[PDB]
Design a protein around this ligand. Structure first.
Ligand code: HEM
Length: 152
């Protein structure tokens, strides 16, 4: 369970993401696909993209990044009281998209890496620790919902 101070460190870096969620989403998903290329295979609409240049030019990828980061932002703003938000997300990601928890870990790693590079003013060590806590909580709770839904 995060403290309010930890939540505020999370939200204060998220405020910078929200200056340009589209550009942050491109950096984050491109980092994910470069570090873990198997994750790109889950996106039937753009799994054919071959290079970072093609990824940066893809409007479909840009929209996926906006949608995902905005949904994550809504979860973070609930400061752990995210039961309602996790229901539809767990159901689609477990049952339709088939996204292992390990891939959510990979995405969390990409988020941390991009925030560390882009936001040293709001992503020092304590802030990064708070974001890790928040993402670990998200993954813990969504893993429990995956299990309820029949996806180990
Ligand atoms: C913080 C974690 C994530 C959030 C908040 C998130 C959020 C979303 C949302 C809101 C949608 C659209 C509605 C839906 O189908 O549920 C979506 C679609 C999708 N997500 Fe995620 N997502 C996350 C992680 C991932 C990861 C790691 C992958 C794959 C490695 C993934 C794969 C997909 C796919 C394949 C779709 C459909 C995309 C399309 O229409 O082209 N998601 N996600």
């Amino acid at each position: 369970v995060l403290s309010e101070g930890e939540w505020q460190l999370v939200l204060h870096v998220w405020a910078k993401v929200e200056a340009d969620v589209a550009g942050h989403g491109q950096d984050i998903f491109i980092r994910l696909f470069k570090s873990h290329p198997e994750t790109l295979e889950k996106f039937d609409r753009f799994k054919h993209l071959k290079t970072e240049a093609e990824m940066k030019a893809s409007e479909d990828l840009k929209k996926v990044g906006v949608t995902a980061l905005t949904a994550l932002g809504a979860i973070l703003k609930k400061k752990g009281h995210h039961e309602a938000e996790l229901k539809p997300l767990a159901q689609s990601h477990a049952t339709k998209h088939k996204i292992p928890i390990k891939y959510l870990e990979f995405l969390s790693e990409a988020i941390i890496h991009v925030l560390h590079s882009r936001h040293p003013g709001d992503f020092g060590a304590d802030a990064q620790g708070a974001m890790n806590k928040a993402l670990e909580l998200f993954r813990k709770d969504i893993a429990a919902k995956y299990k309820e839904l029949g996806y180990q």
